[model samples]
Every structure is written in C-alpha cells, then in structure tokens.
Target chain A: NLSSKEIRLKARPVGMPKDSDFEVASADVLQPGDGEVLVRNIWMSVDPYMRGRMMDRESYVPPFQIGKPLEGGAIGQVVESKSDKLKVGTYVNHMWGWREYATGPAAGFTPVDPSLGPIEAFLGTLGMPGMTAWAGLFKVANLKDGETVFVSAASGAVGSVVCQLAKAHGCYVVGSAGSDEKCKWLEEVAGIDKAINYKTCGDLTKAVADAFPKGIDVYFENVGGKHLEAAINAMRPNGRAALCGMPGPTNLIQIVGKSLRLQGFIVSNYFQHMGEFFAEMGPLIQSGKMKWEETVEEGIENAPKAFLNLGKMLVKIGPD
Target chain B: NLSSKEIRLKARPVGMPKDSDFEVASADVLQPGDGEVLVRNIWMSVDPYMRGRMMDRESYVPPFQIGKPLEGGAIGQVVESKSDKLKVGTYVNHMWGWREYATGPAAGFTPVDPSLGPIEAFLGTLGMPGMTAWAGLFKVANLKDGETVFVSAASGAVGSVVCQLAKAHGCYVVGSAGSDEKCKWLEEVAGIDKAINYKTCGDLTKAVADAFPKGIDVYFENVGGKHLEAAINAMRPNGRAALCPTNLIQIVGKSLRLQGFIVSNYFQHMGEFFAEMGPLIQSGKMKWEETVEEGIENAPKAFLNLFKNFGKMLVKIGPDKAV
Candidate 1:
C-alpha cells in the first residue's frame, strides 16, 4: 500500500507558533482520476504568513483547518498522470506543500522552467516569496532609482529579495535582522550597504535613524511593533512604506505630518502580475544576479520547525 | 488717529491656546500703498488647524510669530484702494484676520461673489472651509457613488461641510459630534444618515461600527484621538480616509489608505469646485450657520469658542450697525 506522510495543524497557535501545534500523519496515495495527476513533493516552503492563517480569523486567505494537512508552495515531480496536460516525470509548481504526495487536477499545477535557477528556487527566489518582494518594493513602495530603502526582517525569504531589488537599483539599502550572523550574511553575501542587528541595537529608532542620516525614502515592514516605530521615525516626508505584516505603533501620527504612505498588501493581491514578475525577475535569475539560500528541514515531520529557521526555509519531503 | 484693534499671540500655547495666551491691542492703520487696498474686515473666521500653526515646530506652512497679529481667512470691503485692480467698497477676501483693519496688496485679495451667499460665505462655505471639504471628500477620500462616510467633529466648519458633501452625493453619512444638540442638527437639519455623540457614546468604535453595519468606505477625520482608531477599525477594504491616528495596523489588513491634506494643494481646482458648489449653495442644497462674537477684542473668544460652537465661528469686526 502506497502511503504519503503529511504535516497537519494539531492546534491553533497563541503567538509565535510552536512545534506542538503540528503533527506528522500518513495517508494512502490516491490514484489519479480524470483530468488529474499524482505528484510527489520534492521541496516544500514554510513562511511567516502561514502563522497568521493558523488562527481562526477572517483574512485575505482562508484559515488552516485543524486536523487537515497544512498547505504552502511546493515544487513536485509528476510520478503518475491521467491527463494530456502533464506527462509523468514533469516538474510542476502548485500550492500543496507539507505532504509527500498530492493527487489533484492537472490544471492546478503549472510546469516550471529548469533554466530559472533550481526547481526549489520556484518557492524561494522565483515564487510567492519572490513575488511578494517584487510587488512590495517595485510596485507598492513605488521605489525610485538611487532612493534609500530600509527593510525589517532583512534576512527573511521575502526581505532578502527586497534588499537585492533595491541594491540592483543603486539604492542606499539598510536592513534590520535578528542576529549578527544574519547581518554579516546580509552585508557580505547579499551585498547590502549595512545590516543592523536589531536585538543588540539598544534603541531601534536611533539605530535606524543613524543608518539613514539623510532619512529613509522607503521602508519595507515585515516585523511590526518596534520596527514600525523605528521606520516611521527614520522616514522622510512623502516617504512610502510597504507593510506586508505588522501591528499598531504609538507614533503613527508621524504618517500624517510627514505625508507618508504606509501601504499594506497580501501577496495574493499581486498574483495577477506574475508575467511582470518573470519579465524582470526571470532575467535577473538567468544572469545569476539574484542569489538565495535554502535551509532545509528533511521530511514532513520537521516542516513546522523549518518555518522557525531563516532564509528560504524548505522541507525536503521526498526524492526529486 | 487712524488705528484698529487686533488680536495677538502673547505666548506659544502649551496645550490649548488659552485666553491669557492672546492679547487684544491697537495698531496704526496704514494708508493704501501703490497697488494695495485698506480693507475693514466684515467677517473673520477661526479654525482648529490654526492650533498647529501656533506651535514653534515647522509644518506644511510657517508658524505664526509671537506678538504678531494671528492670521486667518477674512472677508472685508476695500474701504480705500490706490490700485487699478479694485474699486473702493468692493467686497474681497484675504488672509489677514484677527484685526479690525488690514492694508495689503490688491493682488493678494480675491473679489467675492455675494450672489453666492453672504460675503462671509467666502470664509465658511464656498471658500477655504468649503473648498477643504470638497477636496477632502471628493479628491483625497475619493468618495464613490452612495458610499458610507464617517466624519469626526462633524459640528464644526471643515467636518460640517464634509458631512453635507457626502450627503449631497447620496452617501450614507454618519458624523461624530460632542453634543446631542449638535448631533440633532447634523441628523435633522444637515440630513445626514446618523450622528454619534462620541462623549455619551461609551465605546466610540462600537458606536461607529453600529452606524456602518456593512462598513465605512470613506472617513473624513477632524478629531484625531480615539476617533482615528474608530474610523480605522470600521473601514472596509480599499477604504480611503482624509484625516487631519491610532493603530496603523488596521490600515494594512483592510487595504485602507488614510491621507492628510493641506487643502492649499487643491486651490487650483477652485474653478472646477465653484462650477458645482456655487450652484449647490445658491439652490439651497447647501446649508450652514455662523456663531458670531462681536468686536475685534472678542475674536480670541470666538476662536476659543470654536470647539464649543456649532458651525462656522465668526468674529464681527466691521461697524455698519450689523446684527
């Protein structure tokens, strides 16, 4: 009997989801029905935004159901096919991660290009995370060439791309990360101008202010609360902030006096512009201008912990 | 002795500009210079935004200097003119108020059309105050057909126009006032859908929530404390606000965009505004009230009463046996 291992939401998290909230389970693989394919997930991604969906609330996306397999971006190979759309051994991208196998309609999966980095890069530098950074920085922030940019969660799968996009535009890029190690990687590897370790930085606002002596033109806020407060303090008049995730800040009045535009977005909103994302991003990846790191947690059991780690967290659910 | 009484800022206001913070003093009225006019103010208006200008801090505009006459929108008759631009006794508008008399460049003063309403309408309804409402609601807020609108301090000048403008466009308009009397006038006379007396209303957010069962589409914010949060929480996705804050968190979740304006940025649209609003006022589709304080000395009192008084706060400075 062919069976697949999958991760399920065992409990709704209170704050900062824990390992106990997820459970590893097994399900018998289903044979492909009409207009369907059976694909084994080779690489699966876990993002911070998933934590929001774990709770029972109305959001841009539907909440994760308790006792059901958690879903995310996955790159998989079609082991079996019953439709003319996809042949066996074809690598396709779909939103059905956290499982060893997914049996679904052939239309749900889109074939990926081998030339655009690796298959897993579809989930990291060229997928949802990449799309978020592209839309937030290029479209939402409405960034101008040579402008100053500050990004919170700078080492994040989404934020790293934000830094790259800004730097490629000849921007004065500054990012806030959790640790010195992440900061070093952001500065040396990612080639960002500087990275501030926010945890060690006693006064975040002052640290951010010091980073931008002239003032920040755009802020990409992922980590909210203090980061938001600091970014607002450091932002110039008519500054733009693309808020993907966030919270309430006390000094929000500054948005008014400074004439700042703090725009929040869900990545789903930017899905329509995938063509635009590829037109610019595809060339960057092919030319080797875009760089990304994947930290993998093997097997579906550890997919929950994969999210807790840094930089394009992926779970190697099955063989490629 | 050609002299006039004017109100001056004695000190920079700590929190609220008190009666002590202001000084009523006499000043020499100058003869009209070339290309200038000597005007006696008829109706002087006070606004809440002036409070921001009183502070020493820099803003969109320059801060008022200490011991200098406080400036605001005023309507006056050109009693003496030495310019070919304007004849004497012509009613014109200028930015020189808190004084009984003002001598300024004729080019600085724009002639008012009394056929639109009384000359004071230049200050309140059709001028800066009305233009502010039109621009904030239509341009900044980007109000659509029959959308719901929430206005804070709906009893006062800017907010009052905001409410009527929303109502005029067939929107479900709800405004927050400080008193039931103000609320009554907003609902009954102004023809707004509803009014929330925020003071008596225990939970402002809940009150606002109750007002908009579907959700707020546009919010014109004047009172910027808890009202900011309430309007923010009640906003629907793609909802736009013209505030003049609380949690910015709600802004992201709902796809809401709250923008603040100086209104001067929109003065270029005056020809377009008067084309619509002039007919609206003359046809009696627009209604307003002026709470007046007599004499130049009472100008500060009128300014102080701005928060308490309903509608446009005006000070009578001209002596033409006015009521």
Candidate 2:
C-alpha cells in the first residue's frame, strides 16, 4: 500500500480562482493491472486553460469536477510496471496530473527521451504547449514565409514558442506581454522583431497598429477580447486569426469590411500532428534555434500554482 | 443635345435621409468622346447599400460626391457609341446612374441579351444582387451539399435569390423577413424550410435557436445588430458565417468562422455564376419580385423606401426604347 498527496477542487471557482477553492487531500495509490504502470510524478503542468476546466461549463474539453483530483499534463517515472511497454525507472508523461503518483495503463503515458532537453521540459516546451504553437501557426494560420505575424501572451509557454517558431521560419514577429521584463526576454531571448509591454501601452490598438504600419497577415491569438479587437484593427484585409480564447468587442464588424478570417480551435483535436511537430522542433532544439524560459516550484504543496515564468513546472513531486 | 435631369446630394445624409438633402438638377448630357457611349437610362437601380455610399467615408466603393450626381446600376439604351463594343440602339446597363442620360466608355456598359429575361432583371435577379447571393453562399461560405443556411432579409434582392439558390443546391434553408407576408413568400414561394417574421419575434436569439434544432451550418448575413447576434448564438462549432458580425466572443467559443466581403471582389466569377444561375433562371428554377417608382425625381424616395419595400426596387426614369 502506498499513500499519495493530491490537490482536489474543494469548491468551483468563480471569476479569478482563489487558493481557498482548492485543498490538499490524501489518497491511496492503486497498483497497476493489465498493461498498467505505477508512475511517480516528477514534474506537473499548470496552464491558463486549466481555469476553464475549473468551471462547470460546456467546452471542447470536459470540465474538471469538484472534489476530484485536478487533471493535466505530468511527467513521471515508472516505479512499477505490469507491462514490458514501460520498464521501471523509466521517465514517462501522462494526463493524470495534480497528484504525486499516477497509475494508469502504459499506453496512456509516453516515455520521454532524456536526450531531448530536460525531463521537466516534456511538461512545457517539448510537450502540449509547443505542439499548440505548431498547430495554430502552420496548420490553422497557414503561415507563409516572412509574413508579418503578431502574438498576444507572447512570453508564455505556447506564445513564446509561437514567437520563436515563426521567427525561425523567417516571419516578421511582433509580440505583446504583460510586463516589461517579459517583453525584454521576448525581444532579446526569443529573437522576435518587436515586443510591446501591453501594461505600459495606453491604447493597445494604436500600439499594435504602429508596430505593423502596412498591417499584420496572421494574429496567433492567445488572449481574447481587447487583444482580438486590437489585432483585428491591425490586420490587413484578407488576414487570418487562429483564435485559441473574448469580451464581445463591437469592432468585430471590421471582419466584414476588411475580409478577416478568425478561426477558433481546441488543441486536443490536433494531436495527430504531434510527430510532425517533433520532426520540426526536434532539429530546432538541436541547433539551439529554440530557446525557452521556465519557473520551477518545489514540492507537491506548490503543484496547484504555476506560471510566473514563461513555462512552469512543479518539481520534486515524488521521491527521486 | 439632351437636357438630363439628375438627383444631386445637397448635403451628406445625417441619420435617416430626408427630402431636404437632395436637389433635382438639370445638366446638358455630354456627347460620346474617345471610346465613350451615350446611354439613356430606362430602369435605375435602388439599394440599401446606396445608404453606405451617400456618406463621405472610406468603403469598398467610392462615396457618392456632394453637390454631384449619384452613381449606381442603370439599365439603358446606347443611342451612340464611339466603339464597336456597344452598338447604337442596343439595350445595355452601366454604372453611370442617378441621371436620365449616361455617357461613358463603351466597354463599361454590358449589352443585355433581351432573349434571356426582362432588361431590368439585369438590375436585380440577374445582376449585382443576384451575383452577391451566388458568391456569399457558394464561394465565401463554401457551402456543401444539403447544408443548413439561415438568411436574414430573406425576401430582399440578394437574400431571396440566396434562399432559392441554396434550395436549388439541395440545402435546408431558413429565412427571416420583416413582414409576415415576406415570411410567407420565403416559406411558400421561395421553397425555404422556414421563415421568421423578425418584427413579431420577441427574442430573436431564441427564435433562431428554435428554428435550427441541429444548429445552422451557414449564415448568409444581410441585416445586422440583433440578427447577427441571433445567428452567432445559433451557430454550431466550426460553422461559417459569410461576411457578417455578432457578440463575437461566441466566435472563439463555438469555433465559428466569420468572414466579410464586397461583391466586387468576386466579380471575376461572373462567367461561372451565369453558367449556373442563367440555367436556373431559364428553366424557371428562380423567381423574384420588384417594386418600381416612376420618374427620376422619386429616386431618393425609392432609395429611402428600401426599408419598407420588398424585393428589388427600381426607378423608371425613362422608357425602354432603341432611340
């Protein structure tokens, strides 16, 4: 018998999530059965999209239920296994997160290659968020070479890679981040053409417009509503926006006058292109063309909180 | 020599257009020069889109000039031509409208084949409005076979043909019209699946939702404000609204795609459009209505009455004749 600590939603959060809405709970870790592996989580992901899952609503992904262990991306090590598919002492990543240990079928967890970068990187740059950038840009936006592109939330996990990926692919990339610190890293570290500190900018629409004098061809939307309106205003006629979140801005009527194409998508529908994402990103990582920033929180108590850094990780989740 | 009467804009229309804003001006019709042709207009087209052109603002088309004659589609007779493209006494249509006489480049006027339909039909069901219906539904929306489409202003010029065209393409069509009579025409005459009289519908969103139990695959936008809101609410995930607007938060939520366009962009597809729609009309697969007001003086009244008028509206400024 094994004891595991897990964070569960104590109550459904309203508006901005409060720490009171969550509680650390104790649970007995179940042993693996047919083709199952007992994996002890090392690093877990905390993402903005999780806020949507915390609420009870109809969304593309199922709502994370109250009093249940919160679920998301987690990289763990296989401590025990019933199937030869995953050997013991193997580093694996799965969707059964917000817990110290996850024992599911071996197929549910992907064994990570340690040679790629770091083990925790699978939870950030090398995993879901990276794939999100690839799908939204290459697949949804149909981005052409050297096209002018703008990304909101341009320093976060998905947006950072989106900025760098487009930059590497030879695009004129402009990005907006919340703080000047984030903006500097986006400009200096991420290798984007320009960075706007959205907080310091009085009128984002004007700032974005000034950035693209001619107008932007693609808007990789991470933050919706005002950002969308600003991007739409700055968008050229026949431009495309790969919407990934709105207030209900009135300026959307410009979509007609300008012939804008806004397409919203859920990343879950795009897993089929994961290998293609790796084939491209894998070489980019090797060439050191892709750079990322991360914030690591130590211990299971800090698992529920995340993202002060561009990418986030809940490190030291289980015994090494 | 001809003295042509025209309606000139005395002032930019503020709010709703008033009779005080226009003047009945007379000018000597200039003779054809270079490759220009002299056309005496018979049926001048009136449209709500003209309201957009009346304001001195940037748009897809040039703003109608102040203290100058307005411009729009007018079916006319080419009494004289400097080029062989338009023959003298040939019935034609050109953009030099809002006047009794139009003289322009001969290539600008399309010679209407009288054997096809009424010459004025070139101003409505077989003209720009008709082509708008085809492009929005077939090209912009990329509507598939038997897909569900909801059209606002469903009895008006562009929308009436949209409803019927989609119907001919084997799609499930629903429409909203201002009057119950217009609604009945859409459901009874045009062969759409259902029609909502928007005037009586208390909650347009719920009414639209009730109409589309399976949700609409496509929305052909003509009217705006509440109609756009209703269509956005009723759109399914990945549903495309052709050239329109809404609360738009629902755009991201529903994974909806909304695009807008000026029909001028799609004019290149006119040959293919005629290939499909010409056959449809000739086989009696399409039928429409027109509201005509006599004389050039009633042009603005005809334009303003567009809100209350059903079908395609026109001004009979002159007789259809070969001079």
Candidate 3:
C-alpha cells in the first residue's frame, strides 16, 4: 500500500464555498488488479461546474457526496499496468481526481501524447474545456461565419476558447470579462473583435448595442441574469443563445418579442464529437491559432484555493 | 361615392383600451378602379393580436394608423365587380374591417365557399386562429403522437382548438382556463384529460405537477407571466414550448426549448392546413364556438369585449342578404 492524499467534500456549501467546505484527507492506495492500472495523478483541473455538483440536488450530473473525494478531470502517469493495451510510464487522463493516486481499469484512462505541446494543455486547451468551447459554438450555438458572437466570462477557461474559435470562424466576436486585464487578453491576445469590462461598464445593454449596431446573432451565455437580459436586448431577430451556465434566473420576456432561440447543453452530451473536436482544436493550440492562460496552484491541498481563483485553475500534484 | 361609417384609432391606450380611445367616423367610399370590386361587409373578426397592432411600435405587422380605419379579418360580398374574375353577390374574405364597405382590387379578396359551412367560419374556425393553433402545435412545437400537451388560456380562440386537436391525436391533454365553467367545458365538451381553473388553483406549479406526474412534453403558451413559470417547472427535459406569450427563466437548467411565432409567417402553409383541418372541421369531428356582438356601431365595444371574453368574438355588420 502507498500513502496518498485527496480533497473531500466536508459539507455542502451555502453560497460561495469556503476553505472549511473541503478537507485534505489521507488514504492508502491499493495495487493494480487484473486489467487495471495504477495511476499517480500529476495535474488536476478545477472548474465552475463543480459548484453545481457541490449542492445535493438533481442536475445533469450527480452531486458530490459529503465525506467522499470530489471527482474531476486529471492527467496522471501509469506506474503499474496489468493490461497489455496500457503499458507503464504512459501519461493518461481520467476523471478520478483531487487525489495523488488511483487504481482503475485500464479502459478508464486515455493516453495523452506528450508531443502535443505542453502536457498540462490536456486539462485546459485540449481536454474538457476545449471540447466544451468547440461543441457549444459549433453545435449548441450553431454559429456561422460573419455572425456577431457575444460571450460572457470571456477570459475564463471555456469562454476564452470560445472567443478564439469564433474569431477563427470569421465571426465578429464580442466578449465580457470582469477585469480590464482579462479584457486586454481577449482583445490583444485572443484577437477578439470587441471586449467589454462588465465590472466597469455602467449600462451593459447599451455597451452591447453600441458595439454591435446590427445586433448579436449568437450569444454564448455563461453568466445568466443581467448578462442574459443584455444579450436578449441586443440580439437581432431569429438570434440564438447557447446557455452553458446560469448564475441567476434569466429575463425571458425579451425572447418572445425578439423571436430568439435559447438552448442549454452539457459537454458530455457531445462526447461522440471528441475526435472531431480534437482534430480541429489540436492544431489550433499547437500552431498558436488558439491561446489559453492558466492560474495553477501546486499540490492537491491547494486545489480549493486554485478553484476560488478565476481563469483555468489547475493543481500541480507531481511533475509532467 | 357611397357614404360609410368606420372606426379609427383616436389615440393609443396606456393599458387596457377604453371606449373613448376609438372614434366612429363617416367616410366616402370611392369607386372601384380597373380589376377592382366594391364589397359590403357582413362579419368582422376582432382578435388579441390586434391589441399589439394598436400600439405605435413596430411589430410583425404594421401598427394601426391613428386617423384611418383599423384592419382585420372581414367577410363581405362583392356588391359591384369591375372584373369577370369576381362577380357580384360573391362572398369573399379580405383584410379591410372596422368599416361597413371596402373597395379594393379583385386580387385582395379570396372567394369563400358558401357550401362549406357558415360564412363566419372563414374568420374564426377555418381562418387565422385555427391555422395559428395547427401550425403552432404541429410545425413549431413538433408535437409527437402520444406526448402530453398543456395549453394555457385553454378556452380562448387559439387554445381551444389546440386542446381538441391534441386529444384527437391521442395525446394526454391538460388545459387551464379562468373559470370553472370553462374548465368543465374543456373536460366534458372538448374531451381534455385534465382541466385546471388557474384562478382557483392555489400553487399552480403543484397543480400542474400533480396533474402531469410524468411532466409536460409540449406547452402552448398564451397567458404569460406566472403560467409560463409553472410550465417551466413541470416541463420534462428536452420539452418544447410554443410561445405566444412571454415569461420564465428556468429554460437553461431544465434544457427546455421555446419558440415565439406570428401566425402570418405560416400563411404560405394555408393550402396544406385547409386540406387537413377543413375535413376534420367539415365532418363535425372538430368544432368551434364564437361569441358575437351585433352592429357596426358596436364594433369598438365588441373589440373591447374580446379582451374580456374567453371564446372568439365577432362583430356582425349586416345580414346574410348582403351575400
């Protein structure tokens, strides 16, 4: 048995999760069984969707059980393999996260290519966040070339990739970020057409209307409530909104008059399109056509702190 | 020129329209030009959508002009024909209403078959309201055969037809109305599975959830605000809502999809609609009821009455002898 550490959900959060909500616990890891592999996790991803899982309610995915290790995207190295398909020393990705080591069937772990830029890119640009952006833009939003696209939380993990993908498709991309620094990254680094600092903007609706006088065609709705209302006010006739996240209830009265279409989707629903997503996004990341920024914390113990910080937060447990 | 009386919008109403908001005035009806006919109107239809047109803002249709006769569905007779295509005494349907007489090109009026049923059916059961229900349910809502359907304002013009059609398609139909009398008609006469009196029902969300234990598959939204919120709570995943009104913010979490449409958008499908709906209504398998207020002078009062009435409201201008 090997000594390992994991972060567990100690209590259900009331509103914003605190450090006390999660606890670092010790566990004894078992050896790999037949057709199984023992993986020592190197990198773990903390996402906003995890907030939904923290509450004990019916959602797309089940809520994280109290006193149990929280699950998320993690890249690890296979140290012991019982299957010929997965040999030792291969870097693999799995959902058994917030832990140092885990034992699972070899089929559960997907091998990641080290030659595909940095190994950590698998968790941000080339993994779940990447797929979320691709599927949400192409499938959910049904974005076409020359369409005016607006994305909220435009510098976050999924929103950043969405802005870049929309820009690459020749779409007039408009984004909203919390900070001027994030807005700068969107306009200068991400090459978005327009970036609005939502925190500084007095009237978000007027800002969107002034930015796109012709009106928004596609809205990537990550933050609901006022952002959604502003998007609705600025959307043209027959416009579509891809609702990925909701911070609060939306103002749907505008939807009727504007003849808008609003659709919500979870990324797992589009898992069949992984090969298609990777094919397009893989080259985009490697060739600098798409860019991403990470706020990474070292060690599994600090994963909670990493999650609280904005952007693509990652916990580095071991070496790549 | 012939003397005629018409109702014109004097001013836009702030909220619910008052009788003083309109003025009944006299106008000189001009002679028909080449390929034009003069029509003496018999029945004129008043609808809820016309309320939107009364506003000075732009909509799917143009706003009603302040000093001109308002326009809506009207059934009339060709008193004088300038073209062989339309002969005298022919009953035709046109958009010139709120007036006793209208002169227009022959192309503007569609000849209505007197043998089909009552001439007024062209303005109600077989016209815009009927087509709105048909297209909203089948094309917009994409209703499956056995899916559970819910209709708000269940006894209203568009909603009543939606209930009957859903029941005929072998689906579980739930309807909500303002009165228990209307609810009873829905259950006994319309043959709906469940009828809710929205006014009396405390906690409408629980009423819907209790009635539809399996959850609603299609919601035909007419009365907005609170009804829409209830529909969202009771809607199943991937359920569809045909939005004729507005409300709610739970679409993202439930993965519910909704679409708002104006009935005029589906006018091109009228031929196909008549082919399907005409037979059902013709055989008496499909039925509709209309409440009427008599005379051209009572037109403004009748239009106001339409807002309060549950069923289709029509203004009877002249006798059948005009046809």
The best candidate by DockQ is 2
lDDT of 3 by residue, A41-155 (tens): 9999988789888987777678999999999999999999999999999999899899999898999999988766577788988888888888889997788888999999888
**Model 3, runs deviating above 4 Å:** A1-40, A55-60, A66-68, A77-91, A111-117, A247-251, A308-310, B1-42, B76-93, B99-119, B245-249, B282-285, B293-298, B316-323
Cα deviation at B135, candidate 3, in Å, is 2.8
- lDDT per residue as tens, model 2, A186-242: 999898989998888999999999999899999998777678889989999889998
- Please give the ranking of all candidate structures by TM-score, highest first, separated by commas: 1, 3, 2
Q: Residue A33 of candidate 2: its Cα lDDT?
A: 96
- How well is each residue in B42-112 modelled by candidate 1, as lDDT tens digits? 88888878888899986777888889999999988888999998988888889899988899889988988
TM-score of chain A of each: 0.90, 0.90, 0.92
Better of 1 and 2 by TM-score: 1
Clashing pairs in 3: none
DockQ, cand. 2: 0.47
lDDT of 3 by residue, B1-323 (tens): 67889999999989888898899999987788899999999999998788999998767689998998899999999998898899999999999999999998999999987666688988987888888998899888999999999999988888988998888788999999999889988898888999999999998988988889899999998887778778888998888989872233467666777787768778898878777776777766677777788888899888888656366789999777775
